[PDB]
């Protein structure tokens, strides 16, 4: 049986950087998708 | 008594949930059917007949997909003249390209969704339906005769350049009208010392000269695969509308 | 420069403190003090030989990153797209 | 001066009130007229002609209300065959039933209101009008040709069972198109080792076999009372729209 | 099964209904209590002590309702002052407070006690209105900060004393929450804003520039003002309690 | 040029992202601190001094948690009172306060500390909930104004004294923010409302009409109540600070 | 009749127009007054007394603006302390308050006084902004509750005394609304949170665990802080009055 639980933690700066990069990239992708959909809904991409 | 009310509330909650699953299955069924129909509609725009014969002015046009690959025209005057393209050249009909784009977008809207999520209110389905229907109605609308094409725009069109090379008493326009490939010849008349009418007696300026439409000759021919495509659009629109209506009935029923 | 040694926990607020050396996806060291079971005793543990503890999360994430980059680089960047649906 | 402003404000308040009564009387007048027209439209759906003769395929159909009581069909082949129902059986046309339901609902919307209340903004009248118009437009839409009926759905329809009993190279469909009772015969062709087109060259699966439509024969006949009903729908819709527009003009006028 | 479910909507609906009748009775109980308390608070303002004695300045003021009917003041600088005729200086704070009380009571008595309880937002609006009136009354009773020395000078009170008084003195009488306050400002013009009310404050008056050299403040508790304030506090709490119970109810069944 | 602009959306988006991670860490830091402080505040209410001595009336009260286990009172009118058996009178204010604390702590511990910061409106809602619970606890600890003399009479406390006591005396024990309060109301029925609690207040009880002739009030500071209140104040300020920082952040990048 | 009614829209519209010009003049009057008062409040923070004397601990502090330039302290435990060099400890509360004042004044002076009165919601927004700045200044001036003993220890002030001082003493200097406050915490580490600031409070510092054994608090009124606070209160009331009048107006003609 678990009697006690001890949890310690630390920010990992480069992991944090990675997450930030993932999020920002996701945002770039969605913005591009939105522009493409907006344009394409009326005009042809080519 | 609280036990009655709780067991009870569980009974209504169960019925509503089961109905939510029914509606889930209905939604995805209709969506799948939409992808099938719309992909067939898509297949109609790319390669079926290619040569078409179009009154008192006659024409043989070879149309491959969206490209009017050739256009051979005979005009019977009070006198007959005969025209053709540069042999090497193709005139693209923008309406078909546009329509094909809208179809492509609709199909993307249908295939870029996870067909595996649990059912919700429906407002999201409603938005999907609106998007798809907008694309379909736009495709159909583009296929229809554009009213806002001026005679100077027709003159400035590449099609005039595309013919033996011919005078400035004649303008030639080829367009699509729903389910019909259309050839129109405008016979003109320079005037002695707007542009929207397209009827005999319409006036406009071109180049640096002022011109009047003297006569208009209109011939047309049904394009079978365009007709199939339009039929597909209509059916898809109705399927979408039916799904929207059922979702509304459901949502109002349990609220 | 990129950090390799990390401090987890404090002396006063916690009953565990640790200096973990994390290299890429690999936990190369975990040097740990535990103030247990009584509040005046302390036990001590640390990695054994030149071992690497793999944090699977980091390896997996790195794999997905590689795949995305592949999707972007497995293209002629002089490639004109045909429809908008292809880009989407 | 405050006396001027008060007496004055009383003058505008009086004019606006009197106009509110005018609009009240107009609203109830239009509503009563709607009940009359719609009740006549309703009376058209229940009992007027019952026998109808419907190109190169001919038919004599006896239609009583919503029930196709009998359908006698002659098909002229390259050879003629003759068909009839079980004598005892009736095929119900769902479009008419649906339309009659919408009419019933519209009439309920009109008769289940107190025709004696004082006039208000109108948004409530506007909602009533929207409800009624929705019912009318739905009735009309249902009367129209349903596009989303597949050939396998036609095959799975009871109508096929209803005929002497006939092969699986023939499908028979009877439906309504606005103001026309319609009989269509699909001549099929099993294929050597979707379903939406309804045109020659359309393919689909049925039973456990794969089939293709080889030819399509379409005949139709005007149903007088359906035409009367549709005319009634159109007129009612316009009356509703006129009332909505007048109410909007009023409300914008005094705001 | 639909019968189970119909029975079920019925029992839930019955419980909720009965609870709305409970909340109905609670609302009106509280409202009636509010009218009682507030009418007593009202009775404190109309007509109980009238003479009040307010350590280097002392004064005897006769205050009748909102009217300061007499003010006899002794100042050690001993000089002595009184009112002329039988004139009364009205303390506007009391008038204002009485007005807010009157309005609150109107809000309570001009309503249909045959409410057949609806939702509660209407009750909530009523509660907000009444509470606003009460809090405003109490706020007005409190010492007004935004009174400038030139406004004090331009006040009729300065004109009001017998013998007719000097331009090195200003007299102000006001109410601070619940105690009659008498303040004497001793000035003297300087040789060749106005908000601080403290020694060393400067301001202009008439056509001359003056500085407050020191300030003398005496005060005395007014028992009926205290009673009124207690009433305001209690009423506010009753209102708040009703609002909170209504919120709990409405969130409970929604 | 589009490349410049893409680089540009990238750098702005990176800065904003990093700042959201900062705000993420700040939020959880504050939340953890709130749980610590509030759990200590909670520990003050459960089980530290138990005997309390509360100038013309004096009393010795033994208070265990929310239960007034004994109350021995001397009154100069000298007469002496005590509890019967070993019975405890519960002070509901403490119970209520403890409930609000319990709720706040639940709000803090029943949340996912793996938040991956979103916008802040969710944090703001949490902050509002907790602050409401704290402010309510503190408000309850404060002297309730809306307690009528007949409610005091109908309270079990009157029944609770040994020897069984007279109908010219009422006894009330309550908590005012942080100090145990004992009040004795001396009455006497008149010859052929209820809210003021002051000498000269009139009310009905049983079937007789009574007037408060005078009131005796003694009080004593309760150390752990004071600690709890200090905790409430500090927690409220921490919450407010977090709300304000979140608002600044959200307005900054919007 | 339409002529009557046209005359009528004209007279109503004229009355409402004239009243908007009245409200226009009132708004700008109040705004100008606010700039005057707030600029004086501002002048209190920049440069008036500088030396202050703050019953078992006593101290002489020289405070210049926001900078505590010197602090000479005597403690009976007699031991004596002072600053090193000619260094100044900045009291951040004063800096913050001065910032809020600066912002309020900007809000008032960066606006077009040729407003041609519109509706009032814009004025209302301005009033809200200014009032927020004032209330924040005042709140900051008030004693911060959320300061932990380890934060006090980590403060530069502990490092700041000559002779270099012991680890059984902590010194904190802060501002509470309007009076310079000096507090000495006497500690002693225990044998083998932090928020209460009372005797018997426990916390960790450095690598050792410590408990506050007792606390000594002395304070002294800062005259110009008091002036500033008075200014804040008056400004807040002026703003509130303007808001209320605007609301009355807007509800009156709507």
Author numbering:
A (entry chain A): 240 to 285
B (entry chain D), D (entry chain D): 1 to 47, 57 to 63, 69 to 93, 97 to 180, 182 to 211, 222 to 283
C (entry chain A): 56 to 143
E (entry chain C), F (entry chain C), G (entry chain C): 1 to 47, 57 to 63, 69 to 91, 97 to 211, 222 to 283
The authors write:
Native crystals of the full-length protein grew in space group R3 and diffracted to 2.8 Å resolution using a synchrotron radiation source. Crystals of full-length Rogdi contain four molecules in the asymmetric unit. Interestingly, there are two conformations among the four molecules, with structural differences mainly at the N-terminus (residues 1–14), presumably due to crystal packing. Residues 1–14 in the two molecules fold into an α-helix (designated as RogdiH), extending the α-helix to residue 45, while the same regions in the remaining two molecules are unfolded and form a long loop (designated as RogdiL), suggesting that this region might be flexible in solution. The three loop regions (residues 64–68, 92–96, and 212–221) are disordered in the two RogdiH molecules; however, the electron density for RogdiL is relatively well ordered throughout the protein chain. The structure of the two RogdiH molecules and the two RogdiL molecules are almost identical, with RMSD values of 0.4 and 0.2 Å for all Cα atoms. Given that the N-terminal residues 1–11 are easily accessible and prone to proteolytic degradation, the non-paired region of H1 in the four-helix bundle (residues 1–14) might be flexible in solution. This is consistent with the structure of RogdiL, in which H1 helix residues 1–14 are disassociated from the helix and form a sharp bend due to steric hindrance by neighboring molecules in the crystal. The extended H1 helix in RogdiH engages in a parallel coiled-coil interaction with the adjacent H1 and H6 helices from the other molecule via crystal packing. In particular, a highly conserved hydrophobic patch comprising Leu 23, Ile 37, Leu 267, and Val 277 from H1 and H6 is exposed to the surface, suggesting that the hydrophobic surface generated by helices H1 and H6 could provide a platform for a protein–protein interaction module by conformational changes of the N-terminus into an extended H1 helix. The structures of full-length and truncated Rogdi are almost identical, with a root mean square deviation (RMSD) of 0.8 Å for all Cα atoms.
Rogdi is the human homolog of Drosophila melanogaster rogdi, and is a predicted leucine zipper protein of unknown function. The human Rogdi protein comprises 287 residues, and is highly conserved among species including fish, fly, frog, worm, and mouse. The crystal structure shows that Rogdi resembles a boomerang with an elongated curved structure comprising two distinct α and β domains. The α domain consists of four helices (H1 to H3, and H6) that form a left-handed four-helix bundle through van der Waals interactions.
